Amino acid sequence: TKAGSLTIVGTGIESIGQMTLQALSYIEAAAKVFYCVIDPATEAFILTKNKNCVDLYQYFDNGKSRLNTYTQMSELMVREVRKGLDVVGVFYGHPGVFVNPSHRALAIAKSEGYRARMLPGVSAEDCLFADLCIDPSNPGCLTYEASDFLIRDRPVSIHSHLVLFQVGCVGIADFNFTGFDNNKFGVLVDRLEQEYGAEHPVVHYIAAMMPHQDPVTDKYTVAQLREPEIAKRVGGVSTFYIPPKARKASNLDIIRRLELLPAGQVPDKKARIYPANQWEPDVPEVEPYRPSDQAAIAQLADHAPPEQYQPLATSKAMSDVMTKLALDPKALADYKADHRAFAQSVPDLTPQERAALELGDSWAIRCAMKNMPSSLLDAIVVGVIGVIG
Amino acid sequence: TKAGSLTIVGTGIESIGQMTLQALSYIEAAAKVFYCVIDPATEAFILTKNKNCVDLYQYFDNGKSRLNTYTQMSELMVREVRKGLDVVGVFYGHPGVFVNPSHRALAIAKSEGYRARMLPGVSAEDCLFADLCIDPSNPGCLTYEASDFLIRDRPVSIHSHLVLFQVGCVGIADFNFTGFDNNKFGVLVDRLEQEYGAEHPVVHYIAAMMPHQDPVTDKYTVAQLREPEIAKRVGGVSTFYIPPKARKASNLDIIRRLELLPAGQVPDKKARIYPANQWEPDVPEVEPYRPSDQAAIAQLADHAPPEQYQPLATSKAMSDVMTKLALDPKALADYKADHRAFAQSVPDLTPQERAALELGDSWAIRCAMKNMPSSLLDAIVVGVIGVIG
Ligand SMILES: C[S@@+](CC[C@H](N)C(=O)[O-])C[C@H]1O[C@@H](n2cnc3c(N)ncnc32)[C@H](O)[C@@H]1O
Ligand SMILES: C[S@@+](CC[C@H](N)C(=O)[O-])C[C@H]1O[C@@H](n2cnc3c(N)ncnc32)[C@H](O)[C@@H]1O
Ligand SMILES: [Cl-]
Ligand SMILES: [Cl-]
Ligand SMILES: [Cl-]
Ligand SMILES: [Cl-]
Numbered sequence: 001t002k003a004g005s006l007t008i009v010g011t012g013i014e015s016i017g018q019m020t021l022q023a024l025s026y027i028e029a030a031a032k033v034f035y036c037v038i039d040p041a042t043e044a045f046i047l048t049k050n051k052n053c054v055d056l057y058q059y060f061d062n063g064k065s066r067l068n069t070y071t072q073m074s075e076l077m078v079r080e081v082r083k084g085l086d087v088v089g090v091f092y093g094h095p096g097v098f099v100n101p102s103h104r105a106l107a108i109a110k111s112e113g114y115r116a117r118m119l120p121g122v123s124a125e126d127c128l129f130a131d132l133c134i135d136p137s138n139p140g141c142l143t144y145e146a147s148d149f150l151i152r153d154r155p156v157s158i159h160s161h162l163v164l165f166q167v168g169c170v171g172i173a174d175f176n177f178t179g180f181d182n183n184k185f186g187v188l189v190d191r192l193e194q195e196y197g198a199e200h201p202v203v204h205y206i207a208a209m210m211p212h213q214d215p216v217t218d219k220y221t222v223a224q225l226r227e228p229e230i231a232k233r234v235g236g237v238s239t240f241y242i243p244p245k246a247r248k249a250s251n252l253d254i255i256r257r258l259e260l261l262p263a264g265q266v267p268d269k270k271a272r273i274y275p276a277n278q279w280e281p282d283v284p285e286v287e288p289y290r291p292s293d294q295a296a297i298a299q300l301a302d303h304a305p306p307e308q309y310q311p312l313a314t315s316k317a318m319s320d321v322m323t324k325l326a327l328d329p330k331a332l333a334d335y336k337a338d339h340r341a342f343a344q345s346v347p348d349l350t351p352q353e354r355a356a357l358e359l360g361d362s363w364a365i366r367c368a369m370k371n372m373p374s375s376l377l378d379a380i381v382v383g384v385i386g387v388i389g
Numbered sequence: 390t391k392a393g394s395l396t397i398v399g400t401g402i403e404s405i406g407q408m409t410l411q412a413l414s415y416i417e418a419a420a421k422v423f424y425c426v427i428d429p430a431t432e433a434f435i436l437t438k439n440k441n442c443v444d445l446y447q448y449f450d451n452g453k454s455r456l457n458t459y460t461q462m463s464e465l466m467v468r469e470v471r472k473g474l475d476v477v478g479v480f481y482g483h484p485g486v487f488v489n490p491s492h493r494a495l496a497i498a499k500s501e502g503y504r505a506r507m508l509p510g511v512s513a514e515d516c517l518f519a520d521l522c523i524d525p526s527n528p529g530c531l532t533y534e535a536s537d538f539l540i541r542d543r544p545v546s547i548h549s550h551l552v553l554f555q556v557g558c559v560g561i562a563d564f565n566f567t568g569f570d571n572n573k574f575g576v577l578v579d580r581l582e583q584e585y586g587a588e589h590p591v592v593h594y595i596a597a598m599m600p601h602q603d604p605v606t607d608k609y610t611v612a613q614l615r616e617p618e619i620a621k622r623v624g625g626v627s628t629f630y631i632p633p634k635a636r637k638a639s640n641l642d643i644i645r646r647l648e649l650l651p652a653g654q655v656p657d658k659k660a661r662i663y664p665a666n667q668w669e670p671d672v673p674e675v676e677p678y679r680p681s682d683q684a685a686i687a688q689l690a691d692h693a694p695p696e697q698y699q700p701l702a703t704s705k706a707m708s709d710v711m712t713k714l715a716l717d718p719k720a721l722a723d724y725k726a727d728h729r730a731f732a733q734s735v736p737d738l739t740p741q742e743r744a745a746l747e748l749g750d751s752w753a754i755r756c757a758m759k760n761m762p763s764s765l766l767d768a769i770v771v772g773v774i775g776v777i778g
Contacts, residue, residue: 012409014411016715017409020406041754044708058695066776072688076689091773097526107677121511123515130483142531145526148528151639154548155544171648178765178769210751235770258539258576288496296457306451309447312429312444322404323430327405365599369429376567379567387455387456387562389562
């Protein structure tokens with residue numbers, strides 16, 4: 001194993017709070033940190049956690065091509081990896097969602113034989129699902145960059161969710177500190193009219209970046225986007241959500257091959273599971289407490305845990321070590337290098353706990369931490385299967 | 390404002406480390422916690438952080454409809470909200486991505502006039518982007534539930550990414566503790582053959598759930614999925630990634646309306662930005678260090694910060710308060726109730742810092758924490774615009 005590593009992490013969107021515990025731990029452990037974030041409280045927070053940080057944002061300039069900036073950002077990181085250092089790069093949101101230089105730097109490091117990894121983070125689309133109260137599963141989700149959407153004529157589906165990033169800089173390859181002149185926004189609006197119609201809703205979304213702020217969740221018709229006062233509000237952190245225009249019917253051949261009908265009625269196209277999408281045009285009110293829902297709630301009084309349910313049955317020493325492996329990158333590296341040596345130095349473990357850690361396999365760790373009933377083993381991670389039908 | 394609130398949060402996918410700082414803080418502050426997670430180290434961690442927790446997983450049972458379980462899960466949470474308590478629900482990953490009961494409970498609470506919010510988390514798709522080294526922006530992403538994909542005959546795009554959740558339980562509406570009998574998996578494989586061809590790649594993806602584990606990133610042809618030994622490996626935490634089959638050309642009308650050509654050549658369909666997607670079939674090698682890349686790197690020696698760059702210029706007292714607002718839900722609530730009273734009780738703030746906190750607006754906070762050069766204001770969040778073209 002060569003000296004030198006690159007780990008790229010995210011900060012999430014809302015200042016400080018949306019950073020993951022592991023992103024923080026890698027920032028603290030790093031020899032050198034390079035960052036690109038867009039609020040000052042997050043920047044100040046990062047600087048309290050490591051003594052050797054560099055702001056990547058200084059490599060943008062007026063009329064300097066963004067591609068040249070991204071090549072420079074990547075090279076600054078990889079140069080320190082080649083010197084044998086543990087390097088961490090930090091980007092706002094998820095560091096691989098609509099980001100060029102992270103993928104470039106990781107690919108170069110990997111090709112030259114260094115350790116290289118991206119840790120996921122909370123994206124602007126993750127925030128959109130939470131704030132607009134929608135699930136990508138119901139009824140599917142298409143996600144594009146707005147200029148790419150137009151130039152490559154990417155297809156829409158009127159029966160699924162549509163999410164468009166970078167709607168505030170249609171057709172722009174450069175940078176300006178004061179901001180974008182979004183003079184080709186009308187080209188996007190023309191496309192949305194063609195696909196959806198002039199009276200179809202478009203939601204202008206901006207996630208709150210400070211903890212006390214509310215999100216922007218402003219619904220407009222496609223036609224209203226042509227009004228100059230409304231067009232002016234779309235900027236560099238704006239995303240569009242376009243809800244479905246209609247409900248898609250079921251395929252009879254698939255119903256039969258999956259054996260879903262006992263010769264009769266599947267639910268109708270608009271027999272929706274509560275709650276319905278509030279952004280869809282002409283969406284009917286769905287009943288939250290149907291007779292079937294009331295009967296399920298009545299069964300709560302007599303409920304007992306099923307006999308095949310596996311209750312947690314662990315110890316402080318075992319929960320402490322599993323927490324340490326997740327929150328201490330040095331401890332994890334030590335454990336990975338020698339499972340047996342590490343396991344034998346952990347204080348207060350029971351014999352079973354020690355043995356499970358020595359092996360490292362999931363089933364062993366599960367047996368050590370959960371009580372498995374006889375019922376279960378006289379007959380496999382089974383985590384809300386979602387129902388869309 | 391009525392007493393009682395519901396906040397639903399996520400844990401991310403990888404044990405403990407992928408929880409956000411704000412998710413942890415709300416779990417600690419809650420009067421009552423309800424959770425549904427699928428590894429025991431995460432469960433044990435949650436129980437160390439609040440004294441009043443209930444496992445929602447005990448409401449599943451063999452041959453009990455999942456919809457009835459979800460109605461029960463929702464009702465247990467909302468009952469405590471109606472009593473005037475601050476309630477937190479916890480689901481693995483992102484709590485609104487392929488999850489029924491979170492959306493139901495939040496909608497009921499909101500309709501009855503209680504405070505209701507979802508905090509985003511790291512999803513299985515977020516992990517997929519990071520581990521497979523792909524960006525949803527290049528060249529767009531379609532995301533579906535596998536049974537819905539089949540039953541509603543949802544469209545594919547051979548030029549964009551495809552992600553399918555719940556490929557281990559095609560056509561199943563119920564639960565079993567030992568697991569799913571995935572006997573209709575061949576119906577999915579038939580559809581993938583029709584859309585992509587028998588020799589097109591499909592990546593079987595399972596994100597690591599413990600910190601020391603590696604992810605499963607196993608590429609197969611569509612044809613290979615019919616082999617019983619391979620089909621057997623697909624389970625309840627399996628997701629499929631299907632890469633594009635071809636590159637989409639540019640539209641001449643849009644090129645002209647966005648003014649991208651000076652009468653000549655736009656880059657060719659396969660003149661890719663480094664790095665290329667390694668999962669695409671017959672993808673050519675892309676040069677990481679072209680002459681333009683070498684010239685950009687040569688400019689690093691003479692680089693200085695641009696005159697319109699805004700360096701961080703804050704204080705310990707200001708960074709401490711902004712951190713507290715993000716990490717202490719009680720402090721945030723106090724600040725939101727009375728900006729001026731809160732601001733005047735914060736120790737050691739400068740006059741400008743105090744004034745910015747009193748107002749609460751983003752531009753005021755930015756001025757207080759960053760030095761704004763004369764160059765800038767003699768002429769707006771501008772955070773990697775991604776280039777896809
Ligand atoms: C270069 S990308 C970076 C995205 C980021 N890595 C992420 O994980 O969301 C910039 C685009 O992200 C979206 N974005 C960034 N901040 C946002 C916010 N606060 N609300 C909504 N969308 C945002 C916008 O579409 C913006 O044009
Ligand atoms: C009911 S959903 C819940 C998803 C979860 N809320 C999230 O944010 O990803 C279950 C599906 O998520 C995906 N999933 C869950 N854990 C996973 C893992 N470790 N790797 C890949 N996919 C996973 C699988 O497609 C699975 O069938
Ligand atoms: Cl969060
Ligand atoms: Cl029931
Ligand atoms: Cl993370
Ligand atoms: Cl340059």
